[PDB]
Amino acid sequence: EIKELLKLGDLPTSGQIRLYDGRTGEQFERPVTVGYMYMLKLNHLVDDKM
Amino acid sequence: REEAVVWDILDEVIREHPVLLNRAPTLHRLGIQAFEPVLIEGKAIQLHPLV
Amino acid sequence: MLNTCYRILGLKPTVIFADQIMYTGFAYAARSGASVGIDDMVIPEKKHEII
Amino acid sequence: ARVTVQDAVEKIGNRFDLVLVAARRARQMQVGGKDPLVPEENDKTTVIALREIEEGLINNQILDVRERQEQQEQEA
Amino acid sequence: QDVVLGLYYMTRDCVNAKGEGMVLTGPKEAERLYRSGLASLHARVKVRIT
Amino acid sequence: KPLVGTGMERAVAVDSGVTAVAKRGGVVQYVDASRIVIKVNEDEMYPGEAGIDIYNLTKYTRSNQNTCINQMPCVSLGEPVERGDVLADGPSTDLGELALGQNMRVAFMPWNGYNFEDSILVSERVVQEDRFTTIHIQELACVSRDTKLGPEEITADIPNVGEAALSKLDESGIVYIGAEVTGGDILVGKVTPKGETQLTPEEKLLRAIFGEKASDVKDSSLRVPNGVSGTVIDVQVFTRDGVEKDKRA
Amino acid sequence: EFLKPRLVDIEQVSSTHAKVTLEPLERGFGHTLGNALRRILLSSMPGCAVTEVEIDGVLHEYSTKEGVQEDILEILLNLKGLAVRVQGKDEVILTLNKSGIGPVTAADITHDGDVEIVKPQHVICHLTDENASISMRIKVQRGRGYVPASTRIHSEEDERPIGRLLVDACYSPVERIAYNVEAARVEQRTDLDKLVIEMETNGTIDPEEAIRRAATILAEQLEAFVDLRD
Amino acid sequence: TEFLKPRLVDIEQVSSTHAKVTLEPLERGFGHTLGNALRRILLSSMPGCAVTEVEIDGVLHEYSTKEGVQEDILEILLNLKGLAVRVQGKDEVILTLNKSGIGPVTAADITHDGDVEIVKPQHVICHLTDENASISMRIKVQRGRGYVPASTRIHSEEDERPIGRLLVDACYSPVERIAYNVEAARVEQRTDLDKLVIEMETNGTIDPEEAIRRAATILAEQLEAFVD
């Protein structure tokens, strides 16, 4: 189902795309996994721990 | 107030002074090591990866 | 590699060589661009057979 | 020599009385009764005393002889 | 861990790539070749070393 | 909102008491950033005095962990709403749905050993957009007791402090609402009676020389903790019965 | 033996989106210039952004106006995005005064000569009361890069007015930049390439001026760099 | 508006061919933009002169052995690839080597011509044994930009050439090695500034500093179109 829906978006069905190194501009070998993940900021804040 | 002069004196004191880093479970004698400090921005301690 | 470097040359070179190894390794690891996709882990063709 | 004191221990093999000798010298340097025998690189007296030890100019015996030298000179 | 991965990637050999059977006068030329994109980072080669 | 959820997040959000939910569905008559007033439908309208329903929302109060708990109105003027619709989203809630955090574009790859271990590399772009900035509402308390040397007072007169620090205090000695402070700044001025310093001689000599009239009151004023900087959002004053309230109270 | 790049057709697909092409690029400099330009464009493009706001009845970012629905903090967040083009002067004080029911968008700001509001449709607030009226003064400065509220305190210069509401300054109009080097086969030549720089901005800097300014900055740094006084 | 221009640019040239150059302070991010631009342009596109083709009077394929030369044809090829030639006026010239007797055929043994200068007269080429010691060859030197491997000439050799025509990789670019390290540098209060360490090894012909200078010159010269 993920493969189908990714095709509906017109994106690579394997979910990896080639990325260019922002410093030099050369491409990375072997395209890498990109995509959106839901992340959380925990209550452990450096401001308090220092 | 903490103007540039204080930062210069702090830099000069820190130069050759070593500080000790320890982690609460000091298993063996390498749980305490001394390092030469490098002043950096932020509130997080940066330690060399290899160690 | 590190061990022999220590045994033949001595400390100072082993330290410098270790640092160099870290830096180069990180650089070229970044240039490699290795990642982990869902299709990279291939179910053996004969699983259901043995089952 | 603010990386590895390995060569100073190769000069003095105890690796413990080494640090004591270096402490006597570096306190004789801090309280400015004497001056560093090595061209300073804006270093503190710790690595100065270590560098002085590694070149063989100072040890326990040289420290004692020069100390009794200054003592007997100042007696006059 | 990350280091070993990088070095591992660097040293591994491949059946076929760019510049199979090229003769280089030294490692510095090898590196010059790689950084220009005229050869793959791993490819079997004859090199002069001291 | 989570891009990839499980479907339970609406149940979690509604069932928690942080959302404000409609009891008799109808049409939203007036919307403000403090109250949502809804006109109920004649169908569900109770025969005797149905009238309209008014929902007072809660704005930035301090949570148990010191985080902000404020509700924002979701619906607009003239929207028809049904019984059990989500009027205002509570903290970390969107359109009724649980939004615990935020969804970011991640790429799995080693980037020059700055993510060496489980550490994470992040782009200036996230901080620029202010999407991971939290509001923390901290409480501070200054309490004036009465020692046997004499009751302490809250006046603004604080011996040997620069008037730069006093500038932000009113004549009563309380910070103005909305003043921006930093670590070290004095919030409430307080002095305590204390005498018989018993100074050593040389201090007496110096007092003679410069004309240093010794002030019998020690300093106690509640200064802001080290390294904390924010806006004074609110002030409260509790005076016991009997004592003469001050202008600010 | 070299050639040089001349600015050829510069198409604009949308008001924000522009494609700028450079036709006579010798082999190998496609990527070099693509990357250098991308870097400078993203980092150094001078732009305008809202620096501070004064609304009358509001002491601090957390309070609330009668008859509006967005919080003061959200109104500030909305003002952060306001794209404004000032021509001559560096610091403008725009005044927005509107009353009655309706969505107050950025167009309602009193239009001054030197100031151009690129997107009048940008929403600011929604009124909900016939007599509810908001007045405010938005002070907009010129600047490059990103300066937060907290840093600007260094230059306080007697910030005494509690009415002043600081906003983080995103001093940068360029949103996105990509380049494509494609062989530009001219009927009499072997190996020449064209750079196609596709750039998306908030509609303040025109593409030509951006590219020119980037090339200028790079040229100055290379001037300093080439000479070596040992 | 107004940028920050770097000062205190010191250059400590250990081993005249090896030059390290330190440059600070640079605005955020320009460490890598300039390091990369410089490296790329210097390395891939640099006008130079180098040995391209070789003709041995004795052998038809590069894997055969000549009588009395210890080094294989591969070894002499590699020794000639490293040979640093700087020609003044003429673009492509055909140099002849004829040497006899025991010992090392060195760059000195090449015919001493006017316009072509051999910067390293003592570079070893071949070892010649006793009693036979006959070496005769024609080495062609051409001027060109960058690095071009043998494989593309042999690919694109529609001009079919006689036996013996042994192509060697043409190393035109005089910079042999170049790298740039970026490091943290603070201008007394701003920490978001960086240092550029440019390590360069060239092959004698051009001094490293001059390599840097003309590389940056040509890059700026390309950029000229827009800088007002």
Ligand SMILES: Nc1nc2c(ncn2[C@@H]2O[C@H](COP(=O)(O)OP(=O)(O)O)[C@@H](OP(=O)(O)OP(=O)(O)O)[C@H]2O)c(=O)[nH]1
């Ligand atoms: N661990 C490590 N050390 C490095 C590395 N690279 C260089 N070093 C050494 O660290 C020391 C730092 O020297 P510098 O900091 O550059 O000299 P400086 O104090 O006068 O400024 C040098 O040796 P030194 O202190 O002068 O040795 P010594 O003569 O004092 O015994 C240098 O050789 C490295 O990659 N890793």
